[PDB]
Structure 1
């Protein structure tokens, strides 16, 4: 109903920006327009580089900048939620003083925005050390210049902040809605979840982690309907599909993965591919391939022939459009939520799925736009190794040397309802 401001709270190197990023994507992915407002960003668009002195309490000159940055950011927050139609604005900054939060609660009150706080609390020198190593050594601020000096300036930077740090108080802040995250998710305290969005966020946040691992995404081996250029259905693996299943298992074994979890759909082709691994795996009805409704099992030609208007309209909006009695990519994404969440909770996991399902998952992990999503390239017999990294995720494409047919169909240059068959089928790949 009314927009929301999610307020990050915590000392530097507590993973606020990491949590800001992840949550923002998650929410956006499930249909909630969210944007992050990072103060550190604003700051750099202001003064500049050198010292932790800029963070010194006596530095009144510095405090104005930071104060003007906070208000600039709020300006943006307002027009984002009030004029641009955003749903959630995440305020990413230390916000360590009751004072600062009040400023915020105030602004919120004025504009009628609900407020939820996320406080990341961690007092393990180890954890913080790694955080600085991991993300601060290469922060823009520290144009990779110094050595251990970066640490020096940062530990100091933190200290500045430790001075007036006023954590959310269970008594004084009793009325506020928030979640305190302790020791990278070991313990949590949740107070006053007001609504859906908040019940949701708490859920997401209490289910993500920072344990290094890899996510391998791939489709089932080439299927009989694949070879025939027909979409959907529940065909089994082709000979080539069966060969890939074992090339995959060979690859997986070569990766020397610690306790790998395997997920499949309830569809035969993914299950059969899983069997090749000789390890237990789990089936998820939610990973089944998108459903084409009336075009289930057709060839693009038969679709152009029987449902030409649908065909062109779908090409006009592949993300939202549905074939009669079928799902849209938007639909699939919604249905995939539970899986995405399970993927967050897992460490090393291999997911054997389908072309459309896989596009959704990649779009999620690689932050592609919904516009982009229905068109990602998910070739058969190719493994995509996803390695999450602080704010981000690298990806490696690994072809497993077993030929298969090509199922990627690019957007035709002509998507008009009155376009002609050839114009509508000119991007269809060769199928047997």
Structure 2
């Protein structure tokens, strides 16, 4: 009675499955349609992309369905704002068809592809369009959560057009002045029929968040579940202030020299040289304020000590726990635990070390780190190879499959600069020799 077996890869205790003569599968909670609401140049695509990047990283399969991309596919070349005119009978039919084709793909993603969240990235400015999306959600048993971005500041609108609209594939053959003028006219096409969300009377029963004046104020109505609560918390932690994220590993340690994994060894002579090189690098960056974060492991703390700056130790930044394989070389792992070695090589993200962790466990541990990185400005994170790959996968939108193989060499700073599309990444090698700890698939 109560016979369990431990799964080889993830190390999960499951009931011993003595399937009957004819094994039956039972193939396969409710998916969510996130509805973006607002006039053009209100950061809807920015919100869509950032939220999708975060949700995928935490393990919630999410996809953006941008109606404009369906339009660029249906209509070969973009000419002008005249396409967006409310009196343009033909283009209005085309635009509706594009929205319906995107919703068709939303249904296929959530009901047939194992997707959990579909972000419907369009203006959805009219009650009519939103009633149609709600009907689509109710008939398919999907939850609907609305995210509206409201802003009347002309400086914010003009800045968004200059930063990411003029560079749109629609304005390829246009100069900055033509594109800006056309886009202002394009926004005006939407202003007459725009009906903002009204949680007070009309939209009282809808689950929604109103992001007002680029996150200065929020109106939150009827948060139904955990994922909606998490989105609201995320939106309240992110910001659009300029800043830099520097990510690096501790300087080379004694275990690195011996080819040993885990442990709590100190910096080697080269590691100490990197720590000095890092201080000079940090100084040369001339940052008004800089937060320094380390793990609770000696090698990252010794590296931070060389900076002569205040730092904070996070247990969440500690390297992946190798369980029984801690302090062993990869050769000793292959010889003592050959089954374990091969299992990891085959499934590096989900593989859990015996009495240890997986990259999947790392993500769960690092989520508060990500949330705090979002709220901060200039931050230097001194961590470890697996931790760094996980954080980098979040910033660079890398999949779970790619994550355990990201190149994070020793004595190299990864400088992350948030641009309008995601992160610009610059690599800075601090000219101090070390061993190589990267292992390809």
Q: Which residue of 1 aligns with 2:181?
A: 152
CA distance in 1, matches of 2:423, 2:49: 12
TM-score, length-scaled by structure 1: 0.94
CA distance in 1, matches of 2:351, 2:293: 28
Structure 2 stretches of 5 or more lacking a match? 1-28
* 1:349 aligned residue (370, 379, 383): 379
* 1:396 aligned residue (411, 415, 426): 426
Contact 1:138-1:144 within 8 A present in 2 as well: no
Q: Which residue of 1 aligns with 2:280?
A: 250
**Aligned-CA RMSD value:** 0.9
1:348-395: per-residue Cα shift (whole Å, max 9, x none)? Answer: 111000000000111111111211110111111011111121122111
CA distance in 2, matches of 1:234, 1:388: 33
CA distance in 1, matches of 2:413, 2:114: 38
1:289-321: per-residue Cα shift (whole Å, max 9, x none)? Answer: 000000000001111111110000110101101
Secondary structure at the aligned position of 1:237 is classed as coil
Q: How does 1:16-415 map to 2 (within 5 A)?
A: 16-47=44-75, 48-169=77-198, 170-411=200-441
Give the drift of 1:141: 0.4
Secondary structure at the aligned position of 1:153 is classed as helix
TM-score, length-scaled by structure 2: 0.92
Structure 1 stretches of 5 or more lacking a match? 412-432
1:89-139: per-residue Cα shift (whole Å, max 9, x none)? Answer: 000000000010000000001001000000001111111111000001100
Q: Per the alignment, do residues 131 and 75 of structure 1 end up closer, same or farther by CA in structure 2, a change over 3 Å counting?
A: same
Secondary structure at the aligned position of 1:145 is classed as coil
Secondary structure at the aligned position of 1:11 is classed as coil
CA distance in 2, matches of 1:123, 1:280: 41
Contact 1:263-1:352 within 8 A present in 2 as well: yes
Give the drift of 1:144: 4.6
CA distance in 2, matches of 1:389, 1:62: 32
Contact 2:57-2:399 within 8 A present in 1 as well: no
CA distance in 1, matches of 2:126, 2:112: 29
Question: Structure 1 stretches (4+) deviating beyond 4 angstroms?
Answer: none
Give the drift of 1:53: 1.1
Contact 1:387-1:394 within 8 A present in 2 as well: yes
* 1:8 aligned residue (24, 28, 36): 36
Contact 1:221-1:380 within 8 A present in 2 as well: yes
1:170-211: per-residue Cα shift (whole Å, max 9, x none)? Answer: 211111000000111111110000001111111111211111
Give the drift of 1:80: 0.5
Contact 1:181-1:189 within 8 A present in 2 as well: yes
Contact 1:33-1:87 within 8 A present in 2 as well: yes
Give the drift of 1:147: 3.0
CA distance in 2, matches of 1:297, 1:3: 43
Contact 2:162-2:176 within 8 A present in 1 as well: no
Contact 1:137-1:144 within 8 A present in 2 as well: no
Contact 2:58-2:363 within 8 A present in 1 as well: yes
Give the drift of 1:258: 2.7
